[PDB]
Amino acid sequence: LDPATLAAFSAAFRGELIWPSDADYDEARRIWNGTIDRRPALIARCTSTPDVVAAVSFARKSGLLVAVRGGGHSMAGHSVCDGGIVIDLSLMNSIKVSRRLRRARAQGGCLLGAFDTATQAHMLATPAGVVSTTGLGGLVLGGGFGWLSRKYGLSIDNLTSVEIVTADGGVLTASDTENPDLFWAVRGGGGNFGVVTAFEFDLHRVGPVRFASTYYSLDEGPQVIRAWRDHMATAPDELTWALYLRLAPPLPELPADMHGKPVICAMSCWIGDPHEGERQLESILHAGKPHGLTKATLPYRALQAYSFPGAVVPDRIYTKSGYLNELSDEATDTVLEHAADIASPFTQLELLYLGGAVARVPDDATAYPNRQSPFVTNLAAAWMDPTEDARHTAWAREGYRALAGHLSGGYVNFMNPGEADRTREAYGAAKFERLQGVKAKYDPTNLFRLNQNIPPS
Amino acid sequence: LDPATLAAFSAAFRGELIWPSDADYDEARRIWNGTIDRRPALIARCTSTPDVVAAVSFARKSGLLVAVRGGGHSMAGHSVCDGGIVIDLSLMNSIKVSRRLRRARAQGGCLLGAFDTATQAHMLATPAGVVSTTGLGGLVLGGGFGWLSRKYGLSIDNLTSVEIVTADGGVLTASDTENPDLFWAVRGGGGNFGVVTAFEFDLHRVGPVRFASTYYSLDEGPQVIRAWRDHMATAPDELTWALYLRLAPPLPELPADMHGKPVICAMSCWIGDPHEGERQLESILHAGKPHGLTKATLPYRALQAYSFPGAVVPDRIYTKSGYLNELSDEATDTVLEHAADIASPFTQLELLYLGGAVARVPDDATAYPNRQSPFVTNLAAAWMDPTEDARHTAWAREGYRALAGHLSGGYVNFMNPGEADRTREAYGAAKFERLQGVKAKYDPTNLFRLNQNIPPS
Ligand SMILES: Cc1cc2nc3c(=O)[nH]c(=O)nc-3n(C[C@H](O)[C@H](O)[C@H](O)COP(=O)(O)OP(=O)(O)OC[C@H]3O[C@@H](n4cnc5c(N)ncnc54)[C@H](O)[C@@H]3O)c2cc1C
Ligand SMILES: Cc1cc2nc3c(=O)[nH]c(=O)nc-3n(C[C@H](O)[C@H](O)[C@H](O)COP(=O)(O)OP(=O)(O)OC[C@H]3O[C@@H](n4cnc5c(N)ncnc54)[C@H](O)[C@@H]3O)c2cc1C
Numbered sequence: 001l002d003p004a005t006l007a008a009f010s011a012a013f014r015g016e017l018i019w020p021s022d023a024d025y026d027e028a029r030r031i032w033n034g035t036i037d038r039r040p041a042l043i044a045r046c047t048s049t050p051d052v053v054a055a056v057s058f059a060r061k062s063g064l065l066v067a068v069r070g071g072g073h074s075m076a077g078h079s080v081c082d083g084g085i086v087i088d089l090s091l092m093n094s095i096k097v098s099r100r101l102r103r104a105r106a107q108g109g110c111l112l113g114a115f116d117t118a119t120q121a122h123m124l125a126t127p128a129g130v131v132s133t134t135g136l137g138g139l140v141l142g143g144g145f146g147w148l149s150r151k152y153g154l155s156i157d158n159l160t161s162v163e164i165v166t167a168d169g170g171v172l173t174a175s176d177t178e179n180p181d182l183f184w185a186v187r188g189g190g191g192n193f194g195v196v197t198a199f200e201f202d203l204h205r206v207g208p209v210r211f212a213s214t215y216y217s218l219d220e221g222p223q224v225i226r227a228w229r230d231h232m233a234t235a236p237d238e239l240t241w242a243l244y245l246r247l248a249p250p251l252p253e254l255p256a257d258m259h260g261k262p263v264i265c266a267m268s269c270w271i272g273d274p275h276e277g278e279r280q281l282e283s284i285l286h287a288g289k290p291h292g293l294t295k296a297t298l299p300y301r302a303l304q305a306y307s308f309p310g311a312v313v314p315d316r317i318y319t320k321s322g323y324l325n326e327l328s329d330e331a332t333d334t335v336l337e338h339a340a341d342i343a344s345p346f347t348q349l350e351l352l353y354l355g356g357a358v359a360r361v362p363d364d365a366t367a368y369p370n371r372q373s374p375f376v377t378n379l380a381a382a383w384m385d386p387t388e389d390a391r392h393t394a395w396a397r398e399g400y401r402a403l404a405g406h407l408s409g410g411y412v413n414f415m416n417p418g419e420a421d422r423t424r425e426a427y428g429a430a431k432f433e434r435l436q437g438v439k440a441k442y443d444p445t446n447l448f449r450l451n452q453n454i455p456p457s
Numbered sequence: 458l459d460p461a462t463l464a465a466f467s468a469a470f471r472g473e474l475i476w477p478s479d480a481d482y483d484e485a486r487r488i489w490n491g492t493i494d495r496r497p498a499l500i501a502r503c504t505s506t507p508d509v510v511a512a513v514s515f516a517r518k519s520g521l522l523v524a525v526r527g528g529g530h531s532m533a534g535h536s537v538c539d540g541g542i543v544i545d546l547s548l549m550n551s552i553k554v555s556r557r558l559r560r561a562r563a564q565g566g567c568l569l570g571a572f573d574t575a576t577q578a579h580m581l582a583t584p585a586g587v588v589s590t591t592g593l594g595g596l597v598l599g600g601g602f603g604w605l606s607r608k609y610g611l612s613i614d615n616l617t618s619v620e621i622v623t624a625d626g627g628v629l630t631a632s633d634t635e636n637p638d639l640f641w642a643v644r645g646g647g648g649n650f651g652v653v654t655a656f657e658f659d660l661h662r663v664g665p666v667r668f669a670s671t672y673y674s675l676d677e678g679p680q681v682i683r684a685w686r687d688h689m690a691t692a693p694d695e696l697t698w699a700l701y702l703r704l705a706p707p708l709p710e711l712p713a714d715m716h717g718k719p720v721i722c723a724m725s726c727w728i729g730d731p732h733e734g735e736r737q738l739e740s741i742l743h744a745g746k747p748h749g750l751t752k753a754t755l756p757y758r759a760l761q762a763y764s765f766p767g768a769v770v771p772d773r774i775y776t777k778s779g780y781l782n783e784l785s786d787e788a789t790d791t792v793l794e795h796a797a798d799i800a801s802p803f804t805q806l807e808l809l810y811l812g813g814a815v816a817r818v819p820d821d822a823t824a825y826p827n828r829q830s831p832f833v834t835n836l837a838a839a840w841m842d843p844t845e846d847a848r849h850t851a852w853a854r855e856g857y858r859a860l861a862g863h864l865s866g867g868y869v870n871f872m873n874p875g876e877a878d879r880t881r882e883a884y885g886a887a888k889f890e891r892l893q894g895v896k897a898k899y900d901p902t903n904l905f906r907l908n909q910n911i912p913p914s
Binding site: 014024027047048090091092093094096098099100111112113114116117118120121122123132133207208210251252253274275277278294295296297298299300301302304305306308309310311312313 | 471481484504505547548549550551552553555556557568569570571573574575577578579580589590664665667708709710731732734735751752753754755756758759761762763764766767768769770
């Protein structure tokens with residue numbers, strides 16, 4: 001690099017720089033998806049909005065490929081690059097909560113767990129994903145859903161404004177009253193339009209929630225899934241009920257006989273009065289014979305911390321995901337036969353139901369696509385051994401292929417590293433080309449292209 | 458203030474200053490103990506170690522009373538002052554966790570829930586308190602105990618070094634090899650010796666833990682508490698079992714007749730193989746009939762997020778606590794009789810058992826006193842109404858007074874605002890006077906006096 005520019009950048013940067021020669025480089029460059037092994041020229045750990053301005057201008061002037069990293073959970077591996085700069089936000093994880101306002105301001109590098117901790121100090125909360133180690137940054141920019149979404153919508157449905165650094169180094173506010181074209185785009189358009197350094201959210205009061213997790217044999221697979229899809233079609237918003245097909249974990253609540261064998265793990269909660277929730281959950285817990293039933297009344301922060309129970313975190317991941325408008329009987333049996341071939345104990349075939357509040361938002365209100373498709377399926381292969389990559393990748397691909405016509409769209413936040421060309425299909429032509437128009441205005445050179453990328457014009 | 462001193466301060470300060478005229482003054486100055494209503498001259502929200510150096514030097518030159526704020530959980534209200542400066546660390550909450558080193562470097566404003574999130578990304582953990590909103594900063598400086606402590610010790614038993622800003626504005630490292638007198642003092646000596654801007658910890662791998670919570674009627678109060686005190690005397694380190702006497706929360710797992718009436722809430726976990734945990738917990742669950750039994754195998758981060766059942770944040774608190782060397786039958790009847798008079802649904806009479814790894818550290822190895830007393834009781838009055846302060850406070854004082862002589866020492870982190878004169882008894886003469894000698898060296902002017910204070914010399 002040009003020393004003057006490198007020196008210039010350094011003069012303006014108060015964070016920590018990690019070079020390939022430094023000691024925390026190999027670990028700083030690893031992301032959650034360990035199949036992605038890349039070596040940046042530079043890792044810039046920003047500590048403030050001025051730091052990110054300096055890093056973005058440096059990358060622009062040097063012509064370095066820009067990776068932005070929040071929590072490192074990209075299933076496509078977008079948060080690390082070969083030979084470019086990582087704009088790493090993981091040290092910007094402060095959150096200010098006003099109890100009086102029911103508002104949270106969170107930095108771009110926050111983890112969900114920290115966010116939930118800070119808001120639950122006041123018994124407040126807003127929708128986010130179910131794994132607490134996930135970064136707020138990439139989750140919100142792609143939409144973000146979890147236990148609270150059927151009641152309160154997507155994370156973007158509770159976003160009130162952002163502070164964002166654009167590719168030319170300027171700091172902008174985006175809200176419904178300031179740069180509203182940009183505010184439209186960041187609500188579902190990913191990292192395409194700049195580095196969000198602050199997210200502001202509306203918060204809701206969420207007290208203890210009745211929660212249940214249990215396991216069904218695949219022998220009862222057809223009636224469980226059918227009961228689930230039938231019930232969710234008319235369920236109240238307060239009910240969330242998700243199915244995860246997987247090998248049974250060797251946990252004491254399940255008989256040793258079931259351990260390591262394909263099962264349906266069913267998790268459900270009631271967002272509302274726990275007494276009503278006890279009644280609602282028990283009415284849906286017995287479509288199959290429930291094994292290893294755990295029922296609890298949990299602080300919301302404890303529900304957020306629950307997924308998923310297990311001795312390790314898988315090192316290698318490959319996901320194939322899409323939406324469904326209906327889950328047909330043919331589609332049910334296909335999921336069940338593919339679940340029966342699960343090989344790794346970390347792999348999950350996820351069946352999620354959204355709808356509710358998410359569905360109620362007008363389709364063009366944000367850049368998030370496919371609100372009106374209630375089902376999400378995610379074949380989430382996960383494993384350890386690098387020499388078994390092909391078998392696990394193959395399980396997720398062929399499951400996806402067997403379902404293909406039932407599936408439409410795609411959640412940008414579940415895309416794998418080979419799915420760069422799924423961007424148009426995911427958004428649809430209308431949203432895609434409106435996003436292209438916002439990109440030509442705020443990122444005309446496509447400085448931000450490590451994402452489900454939207455080329456300008 | 459003197460405008461050239463202030464102008465120098467603000468020039469060196471990259472954080473936020475909050476003045477009494479500022480919007481968010483009133484909220485920034487509130488702490489968790491809402492009986493403490495104080496108005497600082499200035500709240501300085503630090504964002505880095507250089508910020509803390511600037512604020513500390515500004516306070517010293519200005520002669521402002523210094524309050525240090527981490528998580529705001531001071532039961533004595535030490536984290537806000539009338540007329541001084543709050544050096545507020547709550548925006549410094551970044552955590553670096555290295556999976557290879559099993560190390561966590563945590564800034565001095567971290568909350569436990571953020572720390573546990575960050576370490577559990579690698580299935581790692583280290584002992585801390587049981588409520589995730591507590592500040593790491595004040596908790597560790599007093600010792601720190603929770604679910605992992607009988608197995609792995611106090612938080613200070615896993616602290617390997619700190620970065621600390623002393624009253625003269627210098628930044629020091631303290632460890633077993635650098636400034637070891639100071640390193641002894643900060644491990645149990647509170648905020649007396651400076652502002653800790655970073656804590657480094659050893660981490661341990663902690664996977665799923667078998668957990669149980671249940672409630673006993675006070676009718677069976679005597680046999681439950683006797684079984685508890687008899688069993689813990691010889692329990693393995695892996696078992697933690699705590700009792701919380703309280704009004705039963707109106708939760709669906711409990712019969713409506715028990716709602717709002719005094720009960721023993723018993724929580725236990727096994728830090729180890731969940732199948733062995735299931736065996737161990739069931740052997741201790743049946744000294745009385747368990748009502749509202751919840752059993753679960755939880756990620757450790759979810760165990761940390763669990764406390765407490767009901768999840769309501771009380772506005773007003775008053776605590777009386779001490780250690781016990783033995784729990785006699787007469788002390789047991791006293792605890793049961795006072796619990797029967799609990800008036801507020803947020804109030805708890807806590808019965809904890811430490812021992813284990815805490816008790817195997819030599820007594821003089823740190824400044825934390827009374828490792829050899831295994832029992833802790835905490836009469837924690839908590840309520841909403843400011844016009845009823847006297848009743849709630851009276852319940853706590855009277856309970857403590859009833860216990861009398863069974864109680865010795867006292868955990869500095871459970872002191873109330875009227876307990877400044879308990880510092881000597883809490884530490885004991887030998888530790889107190891050694892701490893004074895460390896105080897004479899590192900804080901001779903007693904600039905840091907909002908704490909269980911140790912005067913120099
Ligand atoms: C185990 C696991 C569980 C999950 N659970 C769910 C869930 O329940 N619900 C759900 O909706 N999703 C979930 N996700 C997906 C998650 O939403 C996406 O992986 C998301 O992009 C991760 O965000 P991140 O900041 O952690 O990842 P990163 O790898 O850091 O970044 C992902 C993308 O966001 C961009 N980006 C990140 N931060 C910023 C920022 N501040 N400004 C601009 N761009 C940014 C990056 O450039 C990249 O394109 C899960 C993922 C994993 C791995
Ligand atoms: C609801 C609740 C549950 C609790 N649970 C437990 C538990 O399970 N186990 C346990 O051991 N304790 C527990 N505690 C007590 C806790 O350890 C003390 O309240 C502790 O002082 C909290 O630290 P803090 O930073 O949050 O509070 P603060 O009010 O911000 O600070 C308390 C003291 O520490 C000083 N201080 C704080 N941070 C720093 C720093 N970085 N450098 C120098 N000084 C600092 C302050 O000056 C003050 O004297 C609990 C408290 C509450 C209120």
